[PDB]
């Protein structure tokens, strides 16, 4: 597999999370990295990239709530999610512009105040 997403979980309405996308290709080839939403029935939506250079392309609705970053040498890119809220549930979906083009298997994100119950862990 060419890209390992992971990061996700269940928060609280107010929460933040990070999402991480690691390709195991060459950090020479990266291009551009894309994030897309795909609530429950609805369609995957673009929310922003970084390129390779370090430019940021946001979406007209993110309005500074999500920052996209690359980590320094980890071949990976992140989606930092603040202030998140019950719509912010979906599965996120990084996608990759390197030598080939690459779609990731998805993270979901679950925003609820059931994320507070953790009986099924411990």
């Known amino acids: 597999v060419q890209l390992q997403q992971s990061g996700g979980g269940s928060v609280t309405p107010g929460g933040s999370l990070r999402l991480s996308c690691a390709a195991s290709?060459?950090?020479?080839?990266?291009?551009?990295m894309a994030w897309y939403r795909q609530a429950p029935g609805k369609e995957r939506d673009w929310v922003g990239t970084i390129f390779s250079a370090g430019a940021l392309l946001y979406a007209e609705p993110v309005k500074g709530r999500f920052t996209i970053s690359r980590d320094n040498a980890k071949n990976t890119v992140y989606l930092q999610m603040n202030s998140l809220k019950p719509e912010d549930t979906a599965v996120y979906y990084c996608?990759?512009?390197?030598?080939?083009?690459?779609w990731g298997q998805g993270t979901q994100v679950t925003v609820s105040s059931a994320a507070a119950h953790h009986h099924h862990h411990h």
């Open positions: 996608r990759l512009y390197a030598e080939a083009i690459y």
């Open positions: 290709g060459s950090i020479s080839d990266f291009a551009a």
